[PDB]
Design a binder for this molecule. Structure first.
Ligand SMILES: Cc1ccc(C(=O)Nc2ccc(CN3CCN(C)CC3)c(C(F)(F)F)c2)cc1C#Cc1cnc2cccnn12
Length: 278
């Protein structure tokens, strides 16, 4: 029971990824933009065929165009090439043949990182916050090694499992993320790994403000003019200068002066180690 666009595209059966439609029972909605719904999957680990699993399933709406289908097909194929990693949301399967296009991934029980942090504000220990930042750094390092540029790294686009494992995702634009973007991305529309490093800096600031909104008070129209005078966000409350140093390094105007994701993984591991020692 597929749409007119999907029948026209006539996608092939990928034997590594095609999962049976009848072994998937849809449940509660998780997110909207397409839409994400929670589902029960049976035999998603094919060695254990009768074993039940909770998954997340992305799909188009009834009022979706052919361009929206092409984007979801484009999203499907990008996720195949990236590969399995601890800190990327794992593709589990797809449904393409006998109905609407479904893109299946693992369900992160605690939701997105922004709502995770905001929900646990005081009326989250320091090692947990450093672990979050470190894990996102490791995910982005993996992305870069796969020659993959995210373009919209933010707390909303990181998912959190039951065990507080960070899973990098992309849900598209929210219902333009100006406050997360490097100058070259905002102004010249040039996206690189180093432009993702800028956004990681803004994500770090989100984590240690417990899901705070960046540049509070300053409207988006006045932001870019303020950036090229050299102004940046101040050190947030209860944040050491070592972590603030990494943020300011991420916000260097020149991309080459910003740290690499390899360097960010190394620096954050030292902070994780320092907070665990005693
Ligand atoms: C069903 C579903 C389908 C797809 C994706 C998804 O994020 N796909 C994705 C597409 C592209 C990219 C990388 N590109 C970015 C653009 N860029 C230009 C090129 C590189 C990546 C990334 F992880 F690599 F970033 C992921 C997530 C879900 C989810 C879910 C889920 C699970 N639990 C919960 C709980 C609450 C809400 N949602 N949810």
């Amino acid at each position: 029971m597929g749409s007119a666009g999907l029948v026209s595209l006539d996608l092939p059966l990928d034997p590594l990824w095609e999962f049976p439609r009848d072994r998937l029972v849809l449940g509660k909605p998780l997110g909207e933009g397409g839409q994400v719904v929670r589902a029960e999957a049976f035999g998603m680990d094919p060695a254990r065929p009768d074993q039940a699993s909770t998954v997340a399933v992305k799909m188009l709406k009834d009022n979706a165009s052919d361009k929206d289908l092409a984007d979801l097909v484009s999203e499907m194929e990008v996720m195949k090439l990236i590969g399995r990693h601890k800190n990327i949301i794992n593709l589990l399967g797809v449904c393409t043949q006998e109905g609407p296009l479904y893109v299946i991934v693992e369900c992160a029980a605690k939701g997105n990182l922004r709502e995770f942090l905001r929900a646990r504000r005081p009326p989250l220990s320091f090692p947990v916050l450093v672990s979050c930042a470190y894990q996102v750094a490791r995910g982005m390092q993996y992305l870069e090694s796969r020659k993959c540029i995210h373009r919209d790294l933010a707390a909303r686009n990181v998912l959190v499992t039951e065990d507080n494992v960070m899973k990098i995702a992309d849900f598209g634009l929210a219902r333009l993320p100006v406050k997360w973007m490097a100058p070259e991305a905002l102004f010249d529309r040039v996206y690189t790994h180093q432009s993702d490093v800028w956004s990681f800096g803004i994500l770090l600031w989100e984590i240690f403000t417990l899901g705070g909104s960046p540049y509070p008070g300053i409207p988006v129209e006045e932001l870019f003019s303020l950036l090229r005078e050299g102004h940046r966000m101040d050190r947030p409350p209860h944040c050491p200068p070592e972590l603030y140093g990494l943020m300011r390094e991420c916000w260097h105007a020149a991309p080459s002066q910003r740290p690499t994701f390899k360097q960010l993984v190394e620096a954050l591991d030292k902070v994780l180690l320092a907070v665990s020692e005693e």
